[PDB]
Every structure is written in structure tokens, then in C-alpha cells.
Copies of this chain bind each other. A is one copy, B any other.
Amino acid sequence: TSQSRGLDMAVKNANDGISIAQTAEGAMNETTNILQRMRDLALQSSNGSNSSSERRAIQEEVSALNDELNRIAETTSFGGNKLLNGSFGSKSFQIGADSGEAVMLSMG
């Protein structure tokens, strides 16, 4: 019964590990969409039909989106526990009924 109670704590802990990476990856989904948009803008600016002025217009879009990428990195969090700012590091999720049965999760 000690093992049984520990297994429920392991299911609960593993569920938390699932949700923590779910929130982190969901923010990564928008980051992919933003970078694809900035790649569309980058290809557009490279055209020789664009004079100086429209290149400033693309830069304004790119700079605004670039500050948005830093925004998502520094604001995404799990109940105040920041994820994508690089301060999470490697943390272990204990998914066993005995001490020392964790799994290491790290994101850059």
C-alpha cells in the first residue's frame, strides 16, 4: 500500500511533467509562426524592386516581431515559474514509487 500510494503520487507528478512541457511547447508553436512570418518579410525585402523606404517598412515589422519573440521568452511561465527565458534549466520529474526514479527535462 505504500507502493500504491507512491504510484498515485508518481501519476500526479508525471501528469505535472506532461502539462509543464505542454505549456512550454505551446508557446514554441507561436514562435514557429512568428519566425516563418519574419522569413516571409526577409524574402520580400531582398527583392530589387524595393527602394529604401519599403525596406524600413519591413524593418519596422521585423523589429516589432523580434521584440515579440523576446516577449514570449520572458513571459511564458507555469504559475510564475518561467520556462522559455533560459532560467528553468534541467529539472527532474520523479515518476517512481521509490526515491531516485526521475527524468531530466531541459529546454534551451
Contacts and interface: CB of A to CB of B under 8 A. Distances in A.
A35 interface: no
A98 interface: yes
The DSSP consensus for interface residues of chain A is loop
Contacts of A103: 71
A75 interface: yes
Interface in A88-108: 96-98, 101, 103
Interface string A63-83: 000000001000101001000
B71 A98 contact: no
8 contacts: A71-B101, A71-B103, A75-B96, A75-B97, A75-B98, A75-B101, A77-B98, A80-B98
